[PDB]
Amino acid sequence: MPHAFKPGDLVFAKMKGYPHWPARIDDIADGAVKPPPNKYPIFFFGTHETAFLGPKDLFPYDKSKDKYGKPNKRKGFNEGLWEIQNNPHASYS
Structure with a gap:
């Protein structure tokens, strides 16, 4: 059975006006800006x-x-498909 979302999970994430987009749940580094309550930090692959x-x-x-x-066709999408399949846990900084 499903657990709650945790850092490292792989998803397609939906934003208004954009296609469902390959992404991951990120960690929040010490000293980094925290998300609002009930929100997760989503890193979108490719972009x-x-x-x-x-x-x-x-x-x-x-x-x-x-x-x-x-x-x-959207900018960054196909790069993002490669990343989520081939190296979804890398540093893209």
Whole structure:
């Protein structure tokens, strides 16, 4: 059975106006800005941008990849598909 989301989990994350996007739940480094309550720090692969999202916008990657894991014209998307499949836990800083 599912647990709550934790750092390192792989997802497609949904933002208004964007396709479901390959991403991970990030850690929050000591001294780093914390998300709002009930929000997670989401790192989006390919763009390497961060937003704060709650679970309603988070789709576990294994369950969802057949639906959402297809190329897209949007900037950074296809790079992001490579990253989530091939090195999802690397430093992209």
